[PDB]
Amino acid sequence: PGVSVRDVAAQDFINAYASFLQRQGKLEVPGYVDIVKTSSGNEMPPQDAEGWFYKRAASVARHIYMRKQVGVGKLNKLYGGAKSRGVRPYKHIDASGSINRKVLQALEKIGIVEISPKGGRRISENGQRDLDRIAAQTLEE
C-alpha cells in the first residue's frame, strides 16, 4: 500500500538513510568537516567524524519533509543546545550556521530540497522519490 516516512521510526530512518547516503556516495562532503563542533555552544565535533554529516543530512531531510519549508535560522535554533556557560547558569545558544548551510546547499544539487520561493528550504519531488522509498525498504527490511 502506502509507506511514506511517518510510520517508520524517526531515529532508525535517520540512521538507515545515512547508511544509504554513504553507500550511494552522492553527498559531496564539504571537507572542512570534523573542525566544527556542530554547535557554537558545544565543545567538540561529533564522535562519529566519518558519518555524522550523513546523519545530519538524513535528519534535515526528514525535518524539511515533515515541515512546509524551513530556513537556515530554524535549522540553527533546532540544532543548537544548552551551552554550559561555565560558572553561570546554562543558556541555549544557536549552533554553527556553516553545517546547516552546507548540508542544505548539498541537498540542493541532489534535489531533495529547493529554494522555496515563499520561504527557506522545502521538500521537492526528487526528495520524495528517495525518502519514502527508504521508508518502504526499511519497513520490509
Binding site: 511517518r6 510510520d7 517508520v8 521510526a9 524517526a10 515533515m66
Partner: protein
Amino acid sequence: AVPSVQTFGKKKSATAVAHVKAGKGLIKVNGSPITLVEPEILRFKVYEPLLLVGLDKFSNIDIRVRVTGGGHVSQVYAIRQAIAKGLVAYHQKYVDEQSKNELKKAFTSYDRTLLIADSRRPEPKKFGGKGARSRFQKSYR
C-alpha cells in the same frame, strides 16, 4: 455523508484534537501511527484506552489526532484522554448506550482521568520566592 464526530483532550497546556469517523482503524498522532508514539515507556499508556475494550470496535473506527502545546508526557496523557472521549462520543451518537455505558464505566473504573480532565492547574508565583509557595532563604544578622 461520512459520519465524523470530533473531540479533544487537555492536560496542563497540551491540547489534543481528535476526529473519530467510521473507517478501518487508522490511529495517528500528527501523522504518525499509535505504534510510533514517543516515548516507548509511555506508548502503552496511550495504548491503554485501545486495549481496555478490545480492538474489535476500533476495527470500524479510525481516529485522527493532532496535538499542540504542553510537554511530551502531557501530550502522552492528552491523546489517550482524547481517544477515550472520542470513542464514547461516537458510540453515543451511533451505537447503543448499553455498550456505551459499559465503555465509560470501564474507562473511569480503570482510571477516572481518561474522560475527566484533571483540574490540577498552576497558580501564579509570588514575589520573594522562586516557586509559587516557597520563599527565598532568610537571613538574620
